[PDB]
């Protein structure tokens with residue numbers, strides 16, 4: 081026991097002595113545009129609260145109603161006695177929203193991805209992944225006998241070469257796995273091209289739409305709707321702990337046969353407690369909102385993004401091009417990102433800088449994220465503070 | 477393409493006309509001793525709701541306040557802006573209940589187990605696991621690089637053979653992984669022996685107490701307390717989707733540097749949404765209850781089990797000797813299990829039978845699960861039904 085603590089403590093030193101010790105800030109308030117970090121009231125540009133549903137009053141009311149209506153817990157897997165009218169209804173509605181045959185409910189999108197490939201593909205098959213796919217995807221693939229191919233980020237490119245390589249090896253089924261959006265770039269994937277390739281090589285298309293479902297696309301359906309390739313994407317995974325409430329839960333959606341197979345085989349779906357009625361039921365209210373407030377919030381979101389883009393290009397900051405609620409401010413320097421984020425926090429602005437190994441070395445950045453609730457005053461104070469700390473640190 | 481819908485269909489027809497296909501029933505009420513599967517009101521004897529906290533008025537009343545006080549969701553991982561004052565506190569209270577220094581939260585014990593092994597062990601190590609260890613563990617080992625060893629269930633035994641065998645190939649760090657309670661048997665692991673073996677062979681000891689924490693032991697602290705090996709187990713995984721609420725959530729608690737390392741390296745913890753505040757704070761209420769209502773609730777379960785035990789033996793039913801809320805009713809063949817389960821349902825009793833691969837061949841069984849909120853009358857109705865059906869199906 082001590083032998084390993086003689087090995088853990090030392091390694092932890094290396095982390096701290098390399099500026100890699102993850103120390104958590106304590107949020108002393110519900111999730112909103114305005115939050116309390118410690119005792120400090122600051123503006124929030126950190127959370128994946130894309131539509132500001134995290135603390136939406138209509139949702140917390142529903143939450144208070146449904147928790148009593150359905151109880152607090154089911155203490156069982158879906159199969160045994162953990163399936164309720166809510167669960168089938170939510171899976172039914174998500175499918176209607178995305179326009180798919182059926183949906184399978186998970187405790188998260190992390191599990192949804194862990195319980196996808198192993199169930200569907202075997203050794204006689206091949207998975208082809210974008211380099212920067214989510215970690216859950218990465219670990220879902222590792223739990224799979226299929227042949228593994230990884231192509232450069234949005235290379236159509238390194239992809240096709242990966243398709244030929246796989247196609248010419250003798251793959252029975254070829255699945256193309258990729259995130260709808262790249263969490264560090266705010267760049268949206270090229271589904272059109274990807275789908276166009278899936279056809280020539282007779283492959284399947286899987287798309288993790290976590291940072292897209294709810295706000296991306298005309299009706300906020302995500303990348304498929306955005307790229308105009310709807311019904312070309314074979315598999316659709318996603319979370320609910322992001323744009324949709326932000327509590328937890330995840331899903332996979334698509335053709336009846338794939339979902340049924342997962343529902344009978346997916347190990348996370350078979351060996352894990354069912355999602356909480358509190359969040360399943362409240363999620364039903366969230367879908368209702370997208371239909372009523374969605375449009376407004378999606379328009380508020382785009383305008384917010386646009387407004388923040390202009391003020392930041394004017395200050396001198398260079399931002400990765402794009403049309404997404406995620407706005408990476410390229411700082412290149414690891415320490416610079418840290419310092420600024422640290423200073424910005426004092427200016428009432430809460431953000432977080434990412435560096436290697438999260439991103440490449442010399443490509444560090446601060447990932448600012450727009451919410452449908454971010455007012456103009458808040459956007460001005462943020463931009464303003466990005467100037468204060470921007471010139472103070474010689475960034476601009 | 478369409479080519480995969482055919483191989484899925486041609487394999488689904490396999491499971492269907494083989495009795496393997498799974499068809500979920502829909503619970504149309506909260507979780508209780510008295511529930512209604514579909515429209516019919518039956519008694520529930522197949523839920524992991526051991527203390528009956530699933531639909532406990534106090535917990536429900538706490539959920540209503542907390543969600544308003546803390547919001548519906550955080551829409552962020554722990555590190556960035558997902559850690560509330562309530563998340564740290566919970567971990568703290570979890571560590572006090574058990575005898576651990578710190579505690580890390582997961583959205584489920586399925587994530588907890590998965591992000592445990594690979595994070596903590598390398599290729600120069602070795603994990604020695606029981607045969608019937610939960611999938612969470614198995615899947616968790618499959619992500620790790622350590623050499624894997626599987627010993628016969630509760631063989632002390634074959635275990636020692638796999639420990640000698642582990643060293644025979646030079647494992648610097650070796651870990652013993654096991655369930656605290658074996659789900660299909662209701663048998664308590666031999667923690668005393670296993671720990672003595674950790675000593676003699678210098679291995680660590682990790683226990684998964686999803687089916688123990690809350691009701692097993694004098695104070696419900698689980699199998700270590702029960703087996704009197706307190707302060708001899710290094711790693712403790714557990715869930716909140718059973719005895720401690722039934723909502724959702726998982727954890728890993730133990731020594732200092734281990735849980736700090738996990739908090740910095742555990743993938744599911746770095747790449748998955750934070751546990752819903754509604755459930756975090758409510759769980760805090762669960763633990764408070766376990767201080768006052770705990771004692772009686774454990775006692776009730778103790779009596780209940782004995783009562784049902786003896787009652788079924790009167791009818792000549794063959795059980796598996798144990799001191800646990802999990803009472804396996806040995807049925808032998810698969811047909812008996814499912815057919816008896818079905819008849820009981822119509823008799824007003826809902827239980828689920830299991831057979832290969834869930835259990836060894838020619839060793840099917842109905843797993844009856846005791847709750848604290850089970851009445852003697854309800855026990856008489858159930859025991860009664862098992863007789864009526866046992867006689868009719870020619871089992872007794």
Ligand SMILES: Cc1ncc(COP(=O)(O)O)c(C=O)c1O
Nearest residue numbers: 351352353584585586610686715
């Ligand atoms: C022993 C054991 N560990 C872990 C788990 C999983 O926990 P959770 O339902 O929170 O994913 C279970 C339940 O299936 C279990 O029985």
Ligand SMILES: Cc1ncc(COP(=O)(O)O)c(C=O)c1O
Nearest residue numbers: 188189190214290319321748749
């Ligand atoms: C692409 C992607 N996949 C998977 C996940 C994990 O989902 P969850 O937070 O529900 O576990 C996320 C969450 O950020 C994600 O962005």
